Amino acid sequence: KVFGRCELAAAMKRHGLDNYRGYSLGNWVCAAKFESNFNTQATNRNTDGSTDYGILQINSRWWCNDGRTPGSRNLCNIPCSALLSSDITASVNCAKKIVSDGNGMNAWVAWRNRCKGTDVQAWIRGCRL
Ligand SMILES: [Cl-]
Ligand SMILES: [Cl-]
Ligand SMILES: [Cl-]
Ligand SMILES: [Cl-]
Ligand SMILES: [Cl-]
Ligand code: NA
Numbered sequence: 001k002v003f004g005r006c007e008l009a010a011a012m013k014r015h016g017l018d019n020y021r022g023y024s025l026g027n028w029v030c031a032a033k034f035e036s037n038f039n040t041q042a043t044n045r046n047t048d049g050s051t052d053y054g055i056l057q058i059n060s061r062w063w064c065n066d067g068r069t070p071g072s073r074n075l076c077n078i079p080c081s082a083l084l085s086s087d088i089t090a091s092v093n094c095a096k097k098i099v100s101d102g103n104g105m106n107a108w109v110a111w112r113n114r115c116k117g118t119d120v121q122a123w124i125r126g127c128r129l
Pocket of ligand 4: 096
């Protein structure tokens with residue numbers, strides 16, 4: 001599914017991401033934008049053999065099982081495929097574990113390089129939330 005911007009902001013808010021670990025909604029929307037372009041089916045293979053999955057490009061090295069990342073963990077206790085669903089619940093629940101792990105949203109390199117310190121509220125501007 002390719003979400004609309006305000007559509008995704010609404011689903012993220014419903015699932016409790018607005019101000020989760022102190023990160024305003026626009027942070028999460030901006031991160032999604034630059035990670036996946038709002039496409040729940042996004043995948044990206046990394047050089048290390050791990051893969052990033054879904055709207056927030058969650059990585060198989062730590063967070064989900066794809067059966068093909070030697071030495072990896074599955075800290076969200078999910079098949080990585082669950083992160084490609086049109087329903088964002090698995091992505092959001094797993095995001096919440098990640099962002100709690102000590103580095104906040106810096107865990108998402110694109111958030112650090114493209115969102116951090118920008119006017120992230122622009123990402124939720126106009127949305128009926
Ligand atoms: Cl915001
Ligand atoms: Cl594996
Ligand atoms: Cl959803
Ligand atoms: Cl939680
Ligand atoms: Cl933080
Ligand atoms: Na894994």
